[PDB]
Amino acid sequence: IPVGEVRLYQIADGVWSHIATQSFDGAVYPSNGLIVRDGDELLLIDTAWGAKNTAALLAEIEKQIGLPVTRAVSTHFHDDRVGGVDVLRAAGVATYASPSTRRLAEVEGNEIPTHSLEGLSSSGDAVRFGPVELFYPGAAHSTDNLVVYVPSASVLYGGCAIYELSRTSAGNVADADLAEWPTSIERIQQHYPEAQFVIPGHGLPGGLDLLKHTTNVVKAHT
């Protein structure tokens, strides 16, 4: 599946994942994001795939957590990551993304996070943003895709550069760099070898095997 469902669940102390459903290419798909406790506030990673879903997520957070989202980071320019930024900004959330994400979202006519995150322009770059580490592994699902690690919980949020284990063929590669994607995954594996919980952009989370599985699928496409 049903469209417009929004919910969340706890992965660890102060770490949640939010799950929303929306339509892509005329079929209903799930989509994941992250919520991380940031003192008496919350950091949001990615929208819930649209204004309506994202407003519903803000209310779901009050039902289940009860702390204010004060900042949000979008991990690439696609509408399942930035659609809802306008709702967030009007609610008083400060929205962030890399300059590449902001530029590519503008070209697409998508909603545009307000603030630019410098320090993520070269593959392997990392910065801390409140309670998470932001990492640019290089081009993969998109040229701008970021991954997010929670150092205090060993949670790795792969975003849409990482596939769930049930997927056996590549999905949307319109914006991808298939030649670089395996190298970019290799950087993630090398940088976050202690990750205990790995979240794809779409579908079921798992362990570190989601990384090698994604490489397998991408190479088998090529």
Would you list which residues are annotated within the binding site? 5, 40, 76, 78, 80, 115, 131, 141, 160, 164, 202, 213
Query: Can you tell me the distance from the alpha carbon of 151 to that of 157, in angstroms, rounded to the nearest whole number?
Result: 11
Active site residue 76: yes
Pick between residue 38 and residue 46 the one whose CB is nearest to ligand 6TJ: 46
Letter for the amino acid at 143? T
Residue pointed to by tokens 């998470």: 132
Q: What residues pair up with 37 in beta bridges, in sequence order?
A: 42
Active site residue 80: yes
Output the CA–CA distances (angstroms, integers) from residue 153 to 72, 120, 197, in the order listed: 19, 22, 9
The three-class DSSP label of residue 64 is helix
**Residue 140 found at the interface with ligand 6TJ (CB under 6 A):** no
Active site residue 175: no
Name which of residues 26 to 65 contact ligand 6TJ (CB under 6 A). Answer: 29
Pick one of Zn ion, ligand 6TJ, none as the site partner of residue 29 (Cβ within 5 to 8 A by kind): ligand 6TJ
Tell me the closest approach of the beta carbon of residue 139 to Zn ion, in angstroms: 12
Half-sphere exposure of 78 (CA within 13 A, CB side): 22
Under a CB-based contact definition with an 8 Å cutoff, are residues 28 and 2 in contact? yes
Q: Which of 37, 71, 202, 213 touches ligand 6TJ (CB under 6 A)?
A: 202
Half-sphere exposure of 12 (CA within 13 A, CB side): 15
Q: Which of 78, 113, 134, 137 touches Zn ion (CB under 5 A)?
A: 78
Binding site per annotation, positions for Mg(2+): 5, 131, 164
Name which of residues 76 to 95 contact ligand 6TJ (CB under 6 A). Answer: 78-80
